[PDB]
Lipoprotein (Sugar-binding) lpqY
Amino acid sequence: GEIVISYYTPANEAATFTAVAQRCNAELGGRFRIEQRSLPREADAQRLQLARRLTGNDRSLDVMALDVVWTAEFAEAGWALPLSEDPAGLAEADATTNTLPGPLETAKWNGELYAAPITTNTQLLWYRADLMDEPPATWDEMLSEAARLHAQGGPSWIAVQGKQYEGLVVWFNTLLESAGGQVLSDDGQRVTLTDTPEHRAATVKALEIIKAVATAPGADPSITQTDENTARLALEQGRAALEVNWPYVLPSLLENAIKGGVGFLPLNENPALRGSINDVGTFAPTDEQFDLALNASKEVFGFARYPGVRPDEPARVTLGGLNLAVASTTRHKAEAFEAVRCLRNEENQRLTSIEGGLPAVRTSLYDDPQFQAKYPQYEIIRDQLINAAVRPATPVYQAMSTRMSATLAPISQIDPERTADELAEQVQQAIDGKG
Ligand SMILES: OC[C@H]1O[C@H](O[C@H]2O[C@H](CO)[C@@H](O)[C@H](O)[C@H]2O)[C@H](O)[C@@H](O)[C@@H]1O
């Protein structure tokens, strides 16, 4: 029997990347096979399980989909092989061509590639288009619109990622960079949360926003335990009319509405969409069915730019995504690197975004009319990539992030001025190596 290349991804996209792997297996003509294996649903726990396999020298571990913040650590640990170790010498060129350069930077350490981007990510504003006329453009307007809805007994929750984990650090980073701040200096060696008056003011403003959302009159009473999934559910279940979340929320809403899970969008009652869910449960409609389902959603659901912190200042939205790394444990370097190239080829990218919701990194797709029609999020994604925020690249990232979320949470108890100083001190201890 053939070589088996393991391909670890978060369970959130197991269905999509199982499909991509199966396409690759057919394209590979039997020379080897790729098998998808699922990691946990939240970032911190995805890393822990990879770290366990790597530290335990799991020789069956071949390809791993890393979050865009683990590159420096995995490179320095020897866990992610440099692309230059590809026996075929093709990995570096494949990663570099027709690949968005912002995402590509997240796969680098010390000027060298240790992974090939496969998906990027940038959060959008999602809103109930039937309950307001235009969406909020700033966090002040988010709070005012939520208060209006709360006064009328409407869905008053703002759906955010507020629990003690990476998603809270992402929220903070976006608000911070949108206000003109940054966590670390460009070289990663100094803390810049409070080192100048303008940097301090950006940190305080970001903390003011998180605190205000957490203490808002109609706020989610479980906001201190919220993540991507609770935010998606809060809007689908009619408890929130305002949500910030990644682009996968659109196909999720259409799919669950067709299945009968969205009260205010009973697409299950529409006979023309029978069969839009395929044999394994994935929303995969005809072109006509997609248009009809998307158009119906527009009555009650829209997306817009992530809200900024001040008027006429577009948000700087934190980049997310996945970069494919070959694990140093692999017994089959040549096939692992070849698997990476197949998994991220242009037609697999097309499917990854249209079916999975995850933004492609292949630059060409954002100009492709067929892609634009079936992945309507593309234009706001592109707009937000032009001024994206990026979490710092540092080999102490996980340690720094754990301290930050432990300082930010519970978000109900943030004090903007004092938490700003505690955050700066906790980050300093992280880059100092205290751990
Ligand atoms: O597409 C949704 C993804 O949500 C998570 O990943 C995003 O959010 C993380 C923080 O919670 C970021 O660190 C990451 O960069 C983002 O891509 C989830 O972990 C992914 O599995 C989902 O695809």
